[PDB]
Amino acid sequence: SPKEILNLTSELLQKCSSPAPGPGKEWEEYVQIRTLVEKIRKKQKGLSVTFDGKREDYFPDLMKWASENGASVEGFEMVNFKEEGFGLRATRDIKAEELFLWVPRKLLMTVESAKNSVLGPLYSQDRILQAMGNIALAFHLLCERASPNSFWQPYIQTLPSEYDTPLYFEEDEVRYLQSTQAIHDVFSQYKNTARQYAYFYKVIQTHPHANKLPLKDSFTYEDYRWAVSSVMTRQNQIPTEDGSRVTLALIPLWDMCNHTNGLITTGYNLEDDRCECVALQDFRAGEQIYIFYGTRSNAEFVIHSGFFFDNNSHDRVKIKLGVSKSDRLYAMKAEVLARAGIPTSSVFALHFTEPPISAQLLAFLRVFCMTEEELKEHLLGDSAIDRIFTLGNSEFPVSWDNEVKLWTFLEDRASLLLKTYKTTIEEDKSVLKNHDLSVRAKMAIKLRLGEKEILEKAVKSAAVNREYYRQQMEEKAPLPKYE
């Protein structure tokens, strides 16, 4: 058996270290990796360390441990909500902007605490650990989990045992994402995690600095999937105690708040050396306490956080664009972009708003559609820098013609992207209405529906903008000038 696992992890390492097989082979590669991971997983015992009690049996220990080390533990309780899982619920009225939660640095698990732990010796030898604090945090979490006397046991025993990151999806649940933008990130995440598991399985076997690790005696795929899912769904960037550098950290107690829309209200207080959270809104006694995780897209919430957020006001899709080297004005356009601080080719975002495009994407599209005479006015003379300064401002176009061309282009391109999906928006809504689906399956379908609804909105917005600027052109309206 142990030699069999070594052989299997050896094959898995070579499979997941091979170069990308080509985008049209990525689904086939994905299933091939899945088959190998599941073969290993079925030969292992799940999580190496499990706990006797229910998850909620350990929340009092979490509170008592947080209390002894200076954290806030009054005014909220732990409740298992159907929609979000476990969260915090107010036990008293909490006013907006009230400082209601604080967590001193001693309670955090950080890259720095990883370096000073039993993982320290291996951390100083392995180049992946030194370069990637998120993987370092994951192994820190696993080593302390398997250490019964770890300082952080009261926190670890309250963590989830399973997540809804795509690593946990069934094959047919990921299959819903075929032909989307998001599925490539699902593929990468799965291949990344399998490669890392196999790589570190063998590193732990061969390095003497790993001899004192609990992972030397038991390190399963389920261990690693759990550890990386814990870190990707919960990790945070905080300053170092020095204040001059940033590090990654798990923040007990506060990380039990679930997400709602709003603004970030959690910050780090270096003077008191603690995490501090003020209330995002009034919370009456008996209401769930929410925070705003950040301006992430639903693709990021699904892949990295394991949930889909309905009415995510910050949703977006990618659109890759670049000036073609066969364009005869390539040199001029590249130089205008360079003076504006924009690459010649890049990945931009389309947002679910109006306009759908950022200042940087507007500026790129203006240059992308410029005539030679317009390019020359952005390259020469005493007004050239003034012209570049306004390139990302919707109120000061280059010319009416430039606007009509760029919104025509964006309308055409967004329409073309819609045609590359296997299903239509109307088909996706029918699936969600007429089938009975798992949470994970719904996350997948809503994600692919979301991508198309953003593109459809961009098509409508670009068509509306095209009509607007075509009217200004036909009416010979004076172009606005920044003065």
Binding site: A131, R195, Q196, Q235, I238, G267, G294, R296
Partner: peptide, 19 residues
């Protein structure tokens, strides 16, 4: 505002072969 705003679950790079 907050000198050190904390984004819960900030996205990190996991591609060890890229970086």
């Amino acid at each position: 505002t907050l000198k050190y705003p904390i984004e819960k679950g900030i996205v990190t790079n996991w591609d060890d072969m890229e970086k």
